[PDB]
Amino acid sequence: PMPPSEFLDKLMGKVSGYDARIRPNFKGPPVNVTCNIFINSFGSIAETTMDYRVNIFLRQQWNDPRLAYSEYPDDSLDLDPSMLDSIWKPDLFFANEKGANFHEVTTDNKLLRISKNGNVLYSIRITLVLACPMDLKNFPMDVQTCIMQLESFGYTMNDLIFEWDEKGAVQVADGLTLPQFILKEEKDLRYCTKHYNTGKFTCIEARFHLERQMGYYLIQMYIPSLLIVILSWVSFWINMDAAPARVGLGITTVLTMTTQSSGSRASLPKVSYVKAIDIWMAVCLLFVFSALLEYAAVNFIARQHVEEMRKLFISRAKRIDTVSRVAFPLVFLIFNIFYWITYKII
Amino acid sequence: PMPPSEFLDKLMGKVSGYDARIRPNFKGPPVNVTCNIFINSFGSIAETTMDYRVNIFLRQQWNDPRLAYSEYPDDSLDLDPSMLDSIWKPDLFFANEKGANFHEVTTDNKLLRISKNGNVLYSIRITLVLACPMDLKNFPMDVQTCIMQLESFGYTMNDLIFEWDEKGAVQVADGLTLPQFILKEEKDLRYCTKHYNTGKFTCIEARFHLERQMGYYLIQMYIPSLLIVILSWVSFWINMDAAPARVGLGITTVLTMTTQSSGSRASLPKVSYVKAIDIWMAVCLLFVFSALLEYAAVNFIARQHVEEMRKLFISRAKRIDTVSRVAFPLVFLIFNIFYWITYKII
Amino acid sequence: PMPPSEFLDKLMGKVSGYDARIRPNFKGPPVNVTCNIFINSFGSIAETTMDYRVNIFLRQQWNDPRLAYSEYPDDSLDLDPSMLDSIWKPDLFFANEKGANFHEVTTDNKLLRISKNGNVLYSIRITLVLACPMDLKNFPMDVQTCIMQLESFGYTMNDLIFEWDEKGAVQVADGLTLPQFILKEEKDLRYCTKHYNTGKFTCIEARFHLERQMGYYLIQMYIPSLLIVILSWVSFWINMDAAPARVGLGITTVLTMTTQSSGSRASLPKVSYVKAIDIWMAVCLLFVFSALLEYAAVNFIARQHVEEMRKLFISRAKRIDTVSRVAFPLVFLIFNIFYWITYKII
Amino acid sequence: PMPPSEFLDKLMGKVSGYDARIRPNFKGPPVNVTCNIFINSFGSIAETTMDYRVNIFLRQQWNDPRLAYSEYPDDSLDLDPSMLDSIWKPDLFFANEKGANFHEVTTDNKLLRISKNGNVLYSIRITLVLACPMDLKNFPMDVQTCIMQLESFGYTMNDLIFEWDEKGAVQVADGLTLPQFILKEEKDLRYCTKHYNTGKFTCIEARFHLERQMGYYLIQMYIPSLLIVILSWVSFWINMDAAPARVGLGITTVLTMTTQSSGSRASLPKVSYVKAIDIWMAVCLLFVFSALLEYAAVNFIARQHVEEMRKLFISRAKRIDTVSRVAFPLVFLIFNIFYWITYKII
Amino acid sequence: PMPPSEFLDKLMGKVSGYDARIRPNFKGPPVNVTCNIFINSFGSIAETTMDYRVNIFLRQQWNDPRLAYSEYPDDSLDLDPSMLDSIWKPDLFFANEKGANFHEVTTDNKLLRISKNGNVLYSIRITLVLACPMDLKNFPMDVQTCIMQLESFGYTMNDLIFEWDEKGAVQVADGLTLPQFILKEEKDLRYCTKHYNTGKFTCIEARFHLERQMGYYLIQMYIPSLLIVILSWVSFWINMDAAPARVGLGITTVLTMTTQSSGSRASLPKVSYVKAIDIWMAVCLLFVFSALLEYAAVNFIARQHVEEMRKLFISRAKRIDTVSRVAFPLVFLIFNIFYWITYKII
Ligand SMILES: *[C@@H]1O[C@H](CO)[C@@H](O[C@@H]2O[C@H](CO)[C@@H](O[C@@H]3O[C@H](CO)[C@@H](O)[C@H](O)[C@@H]3O)[C@H](O)[C@H]2NC(C)=O)[C@H](O)[C@H]1NC(C)=O
Ligand SMILES: *[C@@H]1O[C@H](CO)[C@@H](O[C@@H]2O[C@H](CO)[C@@H](O[C@@H]3O[C@H](CO)[C@@H](O)[C@H](O)[C@@H]3O)[C@H](O)[C@H]2NC(C)=O)[C@H](O)[C@H]1NC(C)=O
Ligand SMILES: *[C@@H]1O[C@H](CO)[C@@H](O[C@@H]2O[C@H](CO)[C@@H](O[C@@H]3O[C@H](CO)[C@@H](O)[C@H](O)[C@@H]3O)[C@H](O)[C@H]2NC(C)=O)[C@H](O)[C@H]1NC(C)=O
Ligand SMILES: *[C@@H]1O[C@H](CO)[C@@H](O[C@@H]2O[C@H](CO)[C@@H](O[C@@H]3O[C@H](CO)[C@@H](O)[C@H](O)[C@@H]3O)[C@H](O)[C@H]2NC(C)=O)[C@H](O)[C@H]1NC(C)=O
Ligand SMILES: *[C@@H]1O[C@H](CO)[C@@H](O[C@@H]2O[C@H](CO)[C@@H](O[C@@H]3O[C@H](CO)[C@@H](O)[C@H](O)[C@@H]3O)[C@H](O)[C@H]2NC(C)=O)[C@H](O)[C@H]1NC(C)=O
């Protein structure tokens, strides 16, 4: 006899003086709530909004001496979420929620079991859209650090303390991959204790290091910006002194270079500073604009101008072509060395 | 006399000791819940978010010996959703919900009938937005496998086991078509039993094989990329040695080829690897860029340069034109053989 | 004396044995619920999602012999939605809901009146986002047929039957117009009785024939595609044998023709088959691409090439121009006859 | 003594026979509910959906003789929204809701006070997304008339009548401006009484005349369409008889004119008819396309062609240039007079 | 003994005559509620909608003499949100809500503590989407002032007065940064007392001065608009009297200048007036269009035209080139001085 749901209504009901509005160990030491999470889903990391969506299993463990049964033979008593509002629960929240919700499909997704000595496991499923500030100084090569922090709202430090457990405080699902990022295995765990004019409130947080996948931006933004500089080096071969087509190749490789420089920031926040994709576009814009300034310098030296003088201004307008045909694969190559050593090391 | 709604309140009410917070066969064998789904709607398969929306009829069948009436003459007793929170129900959920809801139009869309021996049918309507990781290595020719899995949240393996029924575990509606995909008839059914630090929980899943319709990408992305290579072969005929228009056709078929290569990935996730639509664009980019590098080689050989020597540099700059007029329909044709046999077989 | 709300609480309350969980005519003939709708709003007919939004007044009429009062002098008793969950209601739903909601502004928008013999009128306001598969074979000239179907969820055919009433089963508001479509006056009304593994369930449906307004696509997509073919016929007049500008007009009218062919499908689903707007773009793409292949054929015949021989290759390269200047207004006109007779008849 | 909340529970509670399900003046004259609104926010007037969002204070005043206290000394008794569902309220709704909601921040935003003679003031805050059909025949110069109508849902004309009050039936906030429109001060107030097959229901409505701000469309769409016609008049000066650049200026001013004609309708509904911005684009498309047909006519007359005959065809191909250089500032100016007098008067 | 939750149910329950529907100091002086906020998150400041999203901690302090306990030994009694609807609360709302919500993750995020003398602290977490009208006369250099105002809804001025506290009435989080703006430290605090036809209602508000970051618009919109003017100055060097390429550089630098002038207002509201980014685009449009009107003036003077007369029309068409090659770096530089002194001072 003695089923658990009838027995546990005796443990927390009208008799035995249990009050769900009062924390355990009242007028004594604070409640030590230890926590760990299990990340089911991760991603949709937007940058116009600067937020990310996570789907976690928030597990909470504390001790409640009023729920310590002694004569019931089992070791754990589950509690379905119909009677979930009948015991004490910590008032945990996230300091960067930006909208969140539970999951209530076919049953309230809430887990609650009570051990013999009073250890209470409390596991719920939460979908969060957490805010993290994006630092985009070196944009295709940055390592973002987006955090999540777990505060108390109504209980101060002298009544309720949050801790991480030592046995794997952040678990990650097995095949959890990201379309644009990779989640590094080392996850920092530190304190974030807040001081308001109301009091000091407990806080624990977990950093997540997000490294980008450079392989996408190496296809769309780097190679067509490297192919268009080779396209601007075709103008050094067309008719070798003067043409109406070297102007047509000098203009047109600045046009789509301006479009690709403007199209590279189509889905980005309007940040105040210069980033890594800017000084790849705004330096390769010089290598396609100096190729048209050269033909403007050739067509002014060649068409300026006797017998002796004919040997002068023709050998001077050919010296501009056959030297800058090789000098631009030296200036563009010495920048391409300097660009990647600056950013791949950082 | 004895109406069912008054009779069944005797079966589960205050008398007879029925408690909806306690599973059937308590302190005994686990509850064997068998399930099958009926897909009403399918689709809106996004790839930026990597998710799909489904609209199912979730049927659940278990046995409850406390609900086994004997003296009532009927074989089945329906139960409207007003008294739905009064019997035991399995706490099923989806491990990749990503937000979901019920349907509550004109009545809570819930079905519940109880047989004589205790068999309980439970059919509800759920709209899900399920997550599936997209593998886009061969993008217009891939066969996606998007899954859905049905776990328990509060009952472990020794208390509740999920199964698929043998009589058509996944039904599909009659005229259910997809705008971009086709749903294959063979649907895999296997186990996905999860191990956490709380316990081990039951899980059953059903795979759906989604094959794309290549007919859309054969019109927008393949034929204008095949027409623009024919457009670049017009330059082998214009004035046959030298023109200011062969540059104008050499530049311009790289411009919109760059735009079509960039516009082909307008609604795609920023994946790290190269896909099948990339190495169709980034190889046909060579066939429109080598056609301009040829005229840069023709205009350097023809305009380089006597009586005997005049026969040399004219017959040499015409040999470049009349051979590569036929060689490029050999190189582009030998790639076009190699590109489709690689991907249509896989 | 005897107010209705006090009298009707006697009619359905604890006394007289009324039970809102039991259908009328129990253990007898099925309940014949007759229905008609009033479409307030219609439209926002998307095609990427293939759905439409409607705003209806759902009226339901059935008979309930337990509500047949006799001695109260009035003919009808209204029932405000505070006591709405106290009588029986049919569990109607829509088989293609895709999310829906009620309207609860300043009062629950629900109407309920009870006649003397037991006739119960029940009118509620529902906003639906209904799904309909789009058939886009002849896209600017198609007649779409989007339906809505009204099923029962928990009551089978032997307990509850849906019917349309004979007195105008679908009413439409007076000034209801659509931005892209016109709603035809003939609305089909037929049965859609579903067979599941649970039972057979009643279903009635209403077809809505949606004919497009071709006047939008006649301005944006047809006239600039007809103007660009006239633009390609300008090249037959420029210098009459050879120019570096006939190449520039031959290239450029393929460029924006490719963009307009790609821009015409900017807000469309990725369907597997070819549609009517495709073979207007992909045939007028030939009339702007054959005009450049002609000048490539002229510049190869003119620049190929004596005294007698001079009369040959000049009269042959002029014969190509002065015949195809008139032949292309014959080939483009004989397609334009064949294109519209195929689609305006269907 | 005698606080209001204890006194008013006597006025509407179990004693005195008050029933909130029964309208005042029952079996008598209908209830005359007078209404006025206060528009806090207005705007976000979309045209793809053809709707606008408003944020109003809906005030309702009626008479309830059962709430007419006599011996309590005050003149008004406020009623907080905790007891809001305990007296009678009219079932007002909007016939063009398209989704709406209340505001429940820190308290249900509901006001309710009861005078001595029975006058009841009832003020709530509603956010509406109201539908209005857009008439876009003269699109940048139209005066839109978007309405809002307030019906009853359960009470017919012989039980409940809506009226506007004479003392400012529509108030507008002080600094309420709009980004694209201006709200005219004259607001029409008329009746909209509906007839259904259920009965006839009361309805009152208020028209809002919305005049556009033409200053935006005068910058983006009119001046670059007027600058590009001046750009097409540059071709009458370049080399004065024949050039390969007059073709290049003739083609290119049709290209971006086609893009600006297509880009002007980027965020507009797909209406069946022609509008005012169309016949500014589709007439200035002629003035940039006839300028290229002129050079095609010049290059056919000049290059057609003796001593006497040389004076003929040179003075004939120059007569085309020097007359149409001045005739096009006469034809484009006589249309520009005719265009604005047609639309600014209407 | 005497736990707080049992003691406080005596303080506000059935005994002691406490009524939560009645404000403190009834029939006396008004309730002086003092407020201060803590901005957690700020931003997503849209301009098409003209709104911003804030995430605040709304603290409210007032005095309630009915809650002034005397014999309980503690100084403050917390109150969890399960009993939150049992005492009096001010009916605060925001006059520009535009939709808002609470936060209910793992507990209702509400704080409530009661001191000994009756001081009641009440702190809740609210997410707001507040409306502010944008003034965009000088668009990249403006200082926006977006406000938030806190009114009462049901209590007039003679019953409830809102105030700001003197001890830091608006606190901001530590590392709160914005992607496009910076939040100035001086925050104005003034009154906004409203007068309706119902009464006069209290209101307090806080101004937030938002200054833009000009560094984004200095990269995308200013440098490619300054590079294209240098690109138009290349045409003064190409062949120095006449070319078919100076037309090709005169047309093309107007094309993308028109696109950049249209693309700069891609995500902006359709305002009626001219802004700062307009008269940078619409003046640099003149410097790229007058460079083509010069070559049309050169090609008409040079190609107009003896021995003496040959020296006239060649020295006249070269005087146009060599003077306007230096005059345009004087006119564009004297505007660039006048443009920034006008706007950076304001
Ligand atoms: C929750 O965790 C905190 C911190 O782990 C516990 O506080 C600690 O409690 C112990 C025993 O009450 C304290 O030790 C005591 O130290 C004092 C000198 O400070 C001395 O009288 C004894 O040596 C005694 O052992 C310890 O100082 C204290 N630490 C802190 C930081 O407060 C708390 O007891 C835990 N509460 C529960 C309910 O488990
Ligand atoms: C739910 O399904 C499971 C699996 O089908 C059932 O468990 C099975 O129960 C039977 C009978 O209790 C077990 O057979 C027994 O085998 C043992 C040796 O293992 C031996 O003493 C007898 O031969 C006896 O027949 C069977 O092993 C067991 N299988 C597993 C995997 O546990 C369970 O009974 C079902 N529960 C209900 C309520 O239907
Ligand atoms: C709801 O509507 C259905 C169909 O209109 C009604 O069913 C019909 O009921 C009548 C009278 O009970 C049946 O007529 C009977 O026919 C049998 C032979 O079939 C014979 O014994 C008599 O001639 C008798 O009149 C009729 O067959 C039956 N039709 C069907 C398709 O079932 C039903 O009665 C209606 N229920 C209510 C509550 O109005
Ligand atoms: C609500 O407003 C309506 C309309 O303003 C009121 O109806 C009006 O009531 C008066 C007095 O009952 C009627 O006057 C009567 O006219 C009849 C001839 O029609 C004659 O016997 C007398 O001369 C008498 O004065 C008036 O006709 C009637 N008007 C309409 C259109 O029905 C109604 O009484 C108001 N109800 C309340 C509760 O204020
Ligand atoms: C809430 O705050 C208001 C304003 O701070 C308080 O109103 C003020 O109350 C005091 C004392 O009742 C008034 O002083 C009195 O002035 C009159 C002449 O006006 C004279 O008889 C005495 O000199 C007396 O001190 C003061 O005028 C009044 N101010 C206003 C603007 O009304 C109110 O009492 C506060 N309520 C609570 C509950 O704290």
Please tell me about this protein's structure.
- The structure is a homopentamer of 346-residue chains.
- The first copy, chain A, is an alpha+beta fold and 346 residues long.
- Chain A contains five helices and 15 strands.
- In chain A, 31% of the residues lie in helices and 27% in strands.
- In chain A, strands 1, 2, 3, 5, 6, 7, 9 and 10 form an eight-stranded mixed β-sheet that branches.
- The longest helix of chain A is centred in the C-terminal third of the chain and has 38 residues, at 308-345.
- The relative contact order of chain A is 0.11.
- The interface between A and B is large, with 61 and 63 residues.
- Bound molecules: a molecule of 3 linked components (NAG-NAG-BMA) (5 copies).
- A molecule of 3 linked components (NAG-NAG-BMA) binds at residues 25, 29-30, 32 of chain A.
- Chains A, B, C, D, E: InterPro entries: GABAA/Glycine_rcpt, Glycine_rcpt_A, Glycine_rcpt_A1, Neur_chan_lig-bd, Neur_chan_lig-bd_sf, Neur_channel, Neuro-gated_channel_TM_sf, Neuro_actylchol_rec.
Largest interface: A-B, 61 and 63 residues
Number of helices of chain A: 5
* Amount of beta strand of chain A: 25-35%
The rough form of chain A would be described as rod-shaped
> Structural class of chain A, please?
alpha+beta
What ligand species are in this complex? a molecule of 3 linked components (NAG-NAG-BMA)
Binding site for glycine 2 (chains A, B, C, D, E): 198
Protein name (chains A, B, C, D, E): Glycine receptor subunit alphaZ1
Main location (chains A, B, C, D, E): membrane
Function (chains A, B, C, D, E): Subunit of heteromeric glycine-gated chloride channels. Plays an important role in the down-regulation of neuronal excitability. Contributes to the generation of inhibitory postsynaptic currents. Channel activity is potentiated by ethanol.
